[PDB]
């Protein structure tokens, strides 16, 4: 799934 736009991409996905 495409990363959450407004959120910092380095946090995604939840480990």
């Amino acid at each position: 799934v495409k990363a959450e736009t407004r959120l910092n991409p380095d946090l995604q996905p939840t480990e």
Epitope: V1, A3, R6, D10, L11, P13, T14
Partner: antibody, heavy 117, light 114 residues
């Protein structure tokens, strides 16, 4: 345009409650769900987030022992479970769903919870 | 945890004037690789659900009026309204989208003077 949330809840002190959020119009596996709390006349408070890619949830440390977010992909419904309710839990709980394919943020109408005997 | 400080807490303005509110974070919200600041602004009208206005510190969501502008980088950010109208009456919130927890600021209440 707007997510569906369950109706108002009146629950007694010490009991628990489970609120729901149905993403009508979207496959819940493509939505980033967030739960936000707002006590009367106070500001917005972030509770946690559900990852659509694996089902894992992240929380604000202060809500860790009170809240639990789960999901039922078959019915497109996400849930917020609150345990051992006190008067500090009386608030409106909002369901926030971000659909990154449209770069759009969608909100539910909120569910009002009143903790009283 | 990153602390979000908004100011002023209350603001009274007259229709047509330029409004400016501030949101400061205790740590930088900048991602060096993407060169973007992950600060998000919301608007909440009385009795309604919040609505996202701007993300990435200065990018407006589709449909958001042109009079809403966001700027800033690092730890200092601002939201400006060019020619505030009667319907702009609401509470404005900024939120950390850089790292967990995604904390909200206390908000700035906007009231009109007549």
């Amino acid at each position: 345009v707007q997510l569906q949330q369950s109706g108002a809840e009146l629950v007694r002190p010490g009991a628990s409650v489970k609120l729901s959020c149905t993403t009508s119009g979207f496959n819940i596996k493509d939505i980033y769900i967030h739960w936000v709390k707002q006590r009367p006349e106070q500001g917005l408070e972030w509770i946690g987030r559900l990852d659509p890619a694996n089902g894992y949830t992240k929380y604000d440390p202060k809500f860790q022992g009170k809240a639990t977010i789960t999901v039922d992909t078959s019915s497109n419904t996400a849930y917020l479970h609150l345990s051992s309710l006190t008067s500090e839990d009386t608030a409106v709980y909002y369901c926030d769903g971000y659909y990154s394919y449209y770069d759009m943020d969608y909100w539910g109408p909120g569910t009002s919870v009143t903790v009283s005997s | 945890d990153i602390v979000m400080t908004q100011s002023p807490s209350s603001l009274t303005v007259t229709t047509g004037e330029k409004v400016t509110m501030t949101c400061k974070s205790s740590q930088s919200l900048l991602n060096s690789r993407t060169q973007k600041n992950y600060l998000t602004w919301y608007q909440q009208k009385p009795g309604q659900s919040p609505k996202l206005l701007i993300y990435w510190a200065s990018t407006r969501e589709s449909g958001v009026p042109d009079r809403f502008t966001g700027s800033g980088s690092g730890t200092d950010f601002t939201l400006s309204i060019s020619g505030v109208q009667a319907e702009d009456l609401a509470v404005y919130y900024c939120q950390n989208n850089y790292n967990y927890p995604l904390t909200f600021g206390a908000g700035t209440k906007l009231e009109l003077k007549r």
